[PDB]
């Protein structure tokens, strides 16, 4: 086509989606990770994760307001990944890398799994 | 912080949100523009437009499944702007610029209004 493109548009959309999440506006699901609860938008979770994409395209699960993750999933690792989904920034540290990689593998977030693998390989 | 950033993340999220819109997945509102209807996600509309941000933060309107726009709004201009919201690409042409600018002013999409003004000024 002959379209023009606004370079910062995608980043501005994601920033506003994160502002709606912080103010709990139009969040339609609570993700339960052991004792911890995280509110989010189903559409953003699906856009970022192969696991959520599969869950919310399922004809019964698409209607659930609560999703319980596997008990092996670490709440801090989930929190770091949820923050990444809404910001593009990943808080990857020596103390959390193993939990972040395991959660990214479970959530099917291939770009996160890739950088965790590279950061681990460099430390070996 | 000491975060790492994935450059293409925001663009990849927006691409997936557009794929969900095309397949009518988790769309929660229909925007009526005279005889035409457009399905979308309330969160994306709010993230892109000052008008939708005001509508869907209103305690009564946030629950509506149908929103009727002002009868002066051109359906093609709306369609072009809805496509821009979900892709960052604006199909701006001599034949549609006036309708696109008027719709962007109504929707409160300041970056679109700005480029329409500049494209018009250059043609004068």
């Amino acid at each position: 086509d002959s379209c023009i493109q606004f370079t910062r548009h995608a980043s501005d959309v994601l920033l506003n989606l994160n502002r709606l999440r912080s103010r709990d506006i139009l969040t339609d699901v609570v993700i339960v990770v052991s004792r911890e609860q995280f509110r989010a938008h189903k559409t953003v979770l699906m856009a970022c994760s192969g696991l959520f994409y599969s869950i919310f395209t399922d004809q019964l699960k698409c209607n659930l307001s609560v999703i319980n993750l596997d008990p092996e999933i670490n709440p801090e690792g989930f929190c770091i990944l949820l923050d990444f989904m809404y910001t593009s920034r990943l808080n990857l540290r020596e103390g959390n890398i193993m939990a972040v990689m395991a959660t990214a593998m479970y959530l099917q977030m291939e770009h996160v799994v890739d950088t965790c693998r590279k950061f681990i390989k460099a430390s070996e | 912080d000491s975060c790492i950033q994935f450059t293409r993340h925001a663009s990849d999220v927006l691409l997936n949100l557009n794929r969900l819109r095309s397949r009518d997945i988790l769309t929660d509102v229909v925007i009526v523009v005279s005889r035409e209807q457009f399905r979308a996600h309330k969160t994306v509309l709010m993230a892109c437009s000052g008008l939708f941000y005001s509508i869907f933060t209103d305690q009564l309107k946030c629950n509506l499944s149908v929103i009727n726009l002002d009868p002066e709004i051109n359906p093609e201009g709306f369609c072009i702007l809805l496509d821009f919201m979900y892709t960052s690409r604006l199909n701006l042409r001599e034949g549609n610029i006036m309708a696109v600018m008027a719709t962007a002013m109504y929707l409160q999409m300041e970056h679109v209004v700005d480029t329409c003004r500049k494209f018009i000024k250059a043609s004068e």
Binding site: C3, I4, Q5, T7 | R89, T115
Partner: peptide, 4 residues
Amino acid sequence: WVIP
């Protein structure tokens, strides 16, 4: 704005 750019030409994509």
